[PDB]
Design an enzyme around this catalytic site. Structure first.
Site, PDB file in Angstrom:
ATOM      1  N   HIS A 175     -17.721  81.025 -27.643  1.00 19.18           N
ATOM      2  CA  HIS A 175     -18.006  80.435 -28.947  1.00 19.18           C
ATOM      3  C   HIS A 175     -17.327  79.107 -29.137  1.00 19.18           C
ATOM      4  O   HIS A 175     -16.387  78.780 -28.412  1.00 19.18           O
ATOM      5  CB  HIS A 175     -17.569  81.400 -30.057  1.00 19.18           C
ATOM      6  CG  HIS A 175     -16.101  81.643 -30.064  1.00 19.18           C
ATOM      7  ND1 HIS A 175     -15.485  82.562 -29.215  1.00 19.18           N
ATOM      8  CD2 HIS A 175     -15.118  81.122 -30.837  1.00 19.18           C
ATOM      9  CE1 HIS A 175     -14.187  82.582 -29.472  1.00 19.18           C
ATOM     10  NE2 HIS A 175     -13.934  81.723 -30.456  1.00 19.18           N
ATOM     11  N   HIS A 182     -14.201  72.830 -29.164  1.00 13.62           N
ATOM     12  CA  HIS A 182     -14.255  73.161 -27.756  1.00 13.62           C
ATOM     13  C   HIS A 182     -14.786  74.545 -27.573  1.00 13.62           C
ATOM     14  O   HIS A 182     -14.833  75.320 -28.495  1.00 13.62           O
ATOM     15  CB  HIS A 182     -12.860  73.114 -27.110  1.00 13.62           C
ATOM     16  CG  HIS A 182     -11.924  74.149 -27.644  1.00 13.62           C
ATOM     17  ND1 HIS A 182     -11.247  74.005 -28.844  1.00 13.62           N
ATOM     18  CD2 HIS A 182     -11.530  75.341 -27.122  1.00 13.62           C
ATOM     19  CE1 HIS A 182     -10.466  75.058 -29.025  1.00 13.62           C
ATOM     20  NE2 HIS A 182     -10.646  75.900 -28.021  1.00 13.62           N
TER      21      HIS A 182
END
Length: 209
Positions: free
Chosen positions: A52, A150
């Site tokens: 994720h 990120h």
């Protein structure tokens, strides 16, 4: 104690991408070594696990009603900003990110700022607004900065207080070496159809449009 949430995009990488992420991790550690990393997209039984992009830190709501308002306002903000699906571009060169509670390090892939800027920009004000409306008025520290967005792809096994203390300086050293040493020629991206707001029970998927 409380009613927590946090907000994220989800990625379910294919076996083709698994192979590329595994190469990235192996070559990073080669370059590093001259700490070990476990892949986050493979389980301990060897099955695929989703990745994720976190858009917030953990969100502490003191009441279930406030967390509910947050989630409604997320949906309202998406509808009024006319958000539709988009592809998110992911950098192939990794770096280290510190965990939210600061005792773990992840190897992550930056969500690249320039090619995603138009796609990503709206979410900051949508989240900020839903946060303020639900009682979190000091939202600045809770929304992940575009430069820190990120996808974690590995977790460092067994870090060190010193290594944790100096991860940013390690990033400077490794970032330079990765550019000299390694040639990561992958085109990483994934479709974002919705945004998720976690809950202990289950994660609420909020569809776009």
């Amino acid at each position: 104690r409380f009613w927590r949430s946090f907000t994220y995009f989800e990625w379910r990488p294919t076996p083709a991408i698994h192979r590329q992420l595994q190469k990235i991790i192996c070559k990073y550690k080669e370059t590093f070594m001259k700490v070990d990393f476990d892949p986050l997209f493979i389980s301990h039984l060897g099955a695929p696990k989703p990745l994720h992009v976190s858009l917030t830190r953990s969100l502490l709501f003191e009441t279930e009603e406030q967390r509910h308002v947050f989630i409604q306002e997320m949906r309202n903000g998406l509808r009024n900003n006319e958000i539709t699906p988009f592809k998110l571009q992911i950098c192939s060169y990794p770096k280290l990110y510190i965990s939210e509670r600061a005792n773990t390090l992840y190897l992550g892939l930056p969500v690249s700022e320039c090619p995603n800027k138009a796609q990503i920009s709206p979410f900051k004000t949508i989240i900020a607004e839903a946060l303020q409306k639900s009682g979190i008025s000091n939202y600045q520290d809770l929304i992940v900065s575009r430069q820190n967005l990120h996808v974690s792809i590995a977790i460092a096994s067994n870090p060190s207080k010193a290594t944790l203390k100096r991860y940013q300086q390690l990033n400077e050293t490794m970032g330079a070496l990765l550019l000299l040493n390694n040639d990561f020629a992958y085109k990483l991206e994934f479709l974002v159809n919705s945004i998720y707001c976690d809950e202990n029970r289950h994660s609420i998927r909020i569809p776009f449009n």
